[PDB]
């Protein structure tokens, strides 16, 4: 049932900008999200103090995917464990407790990729979280699909647009509600030539060229969230990337970097089937 939104595809209603995405298949500078627009969006919430850590995504009723740098990053003495956080699913408002709408879960176990490279370039920036008990889906809570080799092959092409969402900074003020922005995937050469960081094949970058006019990007707070695309073949939403890192936010000549989900799917599978 993944990738089919209760308030949209299931009623045959298009969201206000999904057409832009489809037309390309030849958060800074984003807008307010519509209700039910991204039912897989998850908020990672620290208990003490009560604060927004990162974004994340629901891939099933018991599993959540996020960026490993959200939990572990020795350079900033960050090493959050199970009992330190909460998962908040079904949200629209950043700060309010959306009674009867959102659901709050506790974690049973966190799984960080054994070869996550925090010492250098955030290579393999991915982590899985096992919720103590399954959440029930609803109009505002529904899982996103993980890509297959074929979908990845045909959609992850330079020029094609994807969508990023999150409650992170609006400038390099935090938003009232969930923000959304549609960005084009950028040519690997161009991604490589914009930074001094060593870019691996487990990553891709997105954003507008300084001459293209339009702009937009992800920023602090947004890390761990999903970069999704809508398949023109089966009309489902698939999560192609995990918001990872950037040098500043929305800077000209710079781009956002995302964890390549398909490239790491075999690890995801391995952990999921071995640990339920």
């Amino acid at each position: 049932d993944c990738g089919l939104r209760p308030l949209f595809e299931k009623k045959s209603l298009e969201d206000k900008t999904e057409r832009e995405l489809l037309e390309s298949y030849i958060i800074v500078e984003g807008s307010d999200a519509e209700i039910g627009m991204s039912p897989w969006q998850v908020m990672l919430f620290r208990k003490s103090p009560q604060e927004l850590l990162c974004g994340a995504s629901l891939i099933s009723d018991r599993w959540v995917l996020t960026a490993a740098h959200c939990l572990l990053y020795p350079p900033w003495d960050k090493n959050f464990t199970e009992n330190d956080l909460l998962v908040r699913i079904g949200k629209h408002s950043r700060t309010r407790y959306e009674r009867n709408i959102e659901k709050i879960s506790m974690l049973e176990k966190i799984y960080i990729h054994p070869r996550y490279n925090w010492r250098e370039n955030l290579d393999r920036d991915i982590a899985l979280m096992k919720l103590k008990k399954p959440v029930a889906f609803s109009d505002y809570i529904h899982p996103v699909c993980l890509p297959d080799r074929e979908t990845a092959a045909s959609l992850l092409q330079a020029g094609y647009k994807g969508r990023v969402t999150g409650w992170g900074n609006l400038k390099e003020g935090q938003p009232s509600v969930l923000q959304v922005v549609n960005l084009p995937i950028v040519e690997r050469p161009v991604c490589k030539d914009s930074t001094r960081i060593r870019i691996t094949d487990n990553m891709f970058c997105a954003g507008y060229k300084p001459d293209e006019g339009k702009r937009g990007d992800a920023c602090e707070g947004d890390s761990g969230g999903p970069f999704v695309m809508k398949s023109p073949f089966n009309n489902r939403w698939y999560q192609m990337g995990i918001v990872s890192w950037g040098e500043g936010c929305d800077r000209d000549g710079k781009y956002g970097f995302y964890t390549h989900v398909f490239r790491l799917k075999k690890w995801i599978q391995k952990v999921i089937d071995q640990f339920g």
């Binding site: 009560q50 927004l52 909460l86 950043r94 700060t95 309010r96 407790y97 709050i104 506790m106």
Partner: peptide, 11 residues
């Protein structure tokens, strides 16, 4: 500026 949440979850 985060609103308090049910203590049941905090435990």
């Amino acid at each position: 500026d985060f609103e308090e949440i049910p203590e049941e979850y905090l435990q």
